[PDB]
Ligand SMILES: C[S@@+](CC[C@H](N)C(=O)[O-])C[C@H]1O[C@@H](n2cnc3c(N)ncnc32)[C@H](O)[C@@H]1O
């Protein structure tokens with residue numbers, strides 16, 4: 001049932017629970033995007049950049065996906081709705097209140113079986129993925145957490161043997177606000193082949209973009 005509606009996050013979940021079709025992931029995405037366009041801005045990847053994320057998944061067909069930063073579960077629902085039977089999205093969220101919302105959002109959208117939500121800091125969890133979460137390597141990683149953590153987490157994923165030839169990294173917000181150290185690293189390194197996707201900041205007319213970086217191997 002409903003939450004108190006004290007926080008933006010509770011009000012976003014409440015709006016979905018009251019105003020979206022249960023079990024319909026598309027209806028859920030639309031309800032979040034409408035509310036956030038109309039009522040309260042929120043840091044979801046949103047519909048325009050969401051379309052780019054969709055395209056990346058459609059092209060590369062990942063089965064093992066990792067997301068860094070879940071928030072209210074918008075991108076988790078967005079990516080999971082596209083996955084084939086037996087695909088797995090692991091999503092990491094440091095804030096326990098946000099994680100609780102994300103699980104409710106995932107369940108409501110009908111994609112619970114595809115999602116493994118992990119409460120904790122990416123730098124603590126990423127070392128554990130192989131041994132604790134039965135990961136071999138990752139097919140795709142969506143980076144959309146604190147932007148100063150894009151670089152250290154990418155290096156950590158590599159250090160932990162989670163990246164293979166062909167692993168797709170996709171990073172939100174490489175323009176607004178930017179993650180220049182990450183961007184310099186992936187573009188400058190022969191270990192990554194990069195593609196830039198210019199777009200717009202969620203719910204705004206501000207220019208933004210994502211970067212796709214395909215790992216070439218060490
Ligand atoms: C931009 S929001 C996530 C938006 C979500 N990807 C979407 O599009 O719907 C960023 C989130 O990352 C979480 N976060 C920041 N740093 C993190 C870290 N090191 N590990 C795990 N989560 C982190 C924050 O608590 C916040 O909820």
Ligand SMILES: O=c1ccn(-c2cccc(-c3ccccc3)c2)cc1O
Pocket residue numbers: 041043044045144145172173176177201202204206
């Ligand atoms: O994941 C994200 C974290 C922060 N911002 C973010 C960072 C800095 C500014 C703004 C912003 C700018 C103008 C209007 C509204 C928000 C938004 C955007 C994201 O997609």
Ligand SMILES: [Mg+2]
Pocket residue numbers: 043044045144172173
């Ligand atoms: Mg973002």
